[PDB]
Amino acid sequence: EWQENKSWNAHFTEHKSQGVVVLWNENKQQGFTNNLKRANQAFLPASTFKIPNSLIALDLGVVKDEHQVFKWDGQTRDIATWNRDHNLITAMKYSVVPVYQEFARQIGEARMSKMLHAFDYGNEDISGNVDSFWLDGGIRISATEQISFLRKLYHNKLHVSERSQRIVKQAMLTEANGDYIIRAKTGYSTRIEPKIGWWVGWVELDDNVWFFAMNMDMPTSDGLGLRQAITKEVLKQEKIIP
Ligand SMILES: Cc1ccccc1-c1cccc(C(=O)O)c1
């Protein structure tokens, strides 16, 4: 069921880094990783949490649909793309923390805790501030746990409406061409050691789906592009994408 290929470590060490990639072949129900231990170690989800947060906001009516405009609050932040109006699509695309912090405040502690337990999401622990627990609170999730959550979303098996799940999968759209479609979300965790980057999602092919979840050490923001680059290089090596 699970296979470890330690040779894949070269994808990380050749960039003076360390990390884990986890792949899941949906047709064959088989998983692959370079590091079984790190595949099950739990980290802050950071902006990968925008996936469950979006689902909860939509199902509760906090967000009406993917067109609703969340007006910039007029507070100049250091990320230029955050200083503007957003909808769910652009908020996901630009990982707009302040929009999602307001979602969480409107969701509230009780409903957020209950929905994460319903999702079986990570350690399901929202200890900390309701508007930042996924950045510096107690919640944790492993790469293998990301896969389990994403598989439910893919199959519309999470305990929210089909509509909510369809909308979030639309907002996760990252890349599409004649060969494959990638739906995914990046993450960047800096408030608690070790600093890491995430990329989680799946690759849709004509006749199969491959789920993936990776994290890697990220001491500096200069390496953020490696999250996607390394993942796609692993996918190419395994002949999942050309
Ligand atoms: C939080 C943050 C701090 C320092 C540098 C970049 C970022 C950031 C901000 C928004 C999106 C992303 C990203 O990866 O997509 C990264």
Swiss-Prot record:
Effect annotated for changing R183A: No significant effect on catalytic efficiency with respect to ampicillin, nitrocefin or imipenem. Very little reduction in dimerization at neutral pH. Predominantly monomer at neutral pH. Slightly decreases thermal stability
Matching Gene3D superfamilies: DD-peptidase/beta-lactamase superfamily
GO term, biological process aspect, one: antibiotic catabolic process
Post-translational modification: Carboxylated on the epsilon-amino group of a lysine, with the resulting carbamate functional group serving as a general base. Probably N-carboxylated at Lys-50 at neutral pH in vivo and undergoes complete N-decarboxylation, at pH 4.1, in vitro.
Up-regulation conditions: Expressed from an upstream promoter, P(out), in an insertion sequence IS1999.
GO cellular component terms, semicolon-separated: plasma membrane
Effect of mutating S47G: Increases thermal stability. Abolishes hydrolysis of cephalothin and decreases catalytic efficiency about 60-fold with respect to ampicillin
Active site (record annotation): S47 (acyl-ester intermediate)
Statement: the UniProt record of this protein carries the keyword Zinc: no
Residues binding a beta-lactam, per UniProt: S47, K50, S95, R227
Keyword set, alphabetical order: Antibiotic resistance, Hydrolase, Plasmid, Signal
Catalyzed reaction equations: a beta-lactam + H2O = a substituted beta-amino acid
A Pfam family of this chain: Transpeptidase
EC number per UniProt: 3.5.2.6
Chain positions found as N6-carboxylysine: K50
Keyword Repressor among record annotations: no
Activity control: Inhibited by avibactam, related diazabicyclooctane (DBO) derivatives and by bicyclic boronic acids, via a covalent binding to Ser-47. Inhibited by chloride, bromide and iodide ions. Not inhibited by the beta-lactamase-blocking agents, clavulanic acid or tazobactam.
Record-linked SUPFAM superfamilies: beta-lactamase/transpeptidase-like
A GO term, aspect molecular function: penicillin binding
Record text on subunit structure and interactions: Monomer. Dimer.
Family per record: Belongs to the class-D beta-lactamase family.
Task of the protein: Class D beta-lactamase which confers resistance to the beta-lactam antibiotics, including amoxicillin, and moderate resistance to cephalosporins and carbapenems such as cephalothin and imipenem; in the DH10B strain of E.coli. Acts via hydrolysis of the beta-lactam ring. Has oxacillin-, cephalothin- and imipenem-hydrolyzing activities.
Note: When OXA-48 is present in clinical isolates of K.pneumoniae, increasing chloride concentration during antibiotic treatment reduces bacterial growth.
Protein name: Beta-lactamase OXA-48
Recorded name of the encoding gene: OXA-48
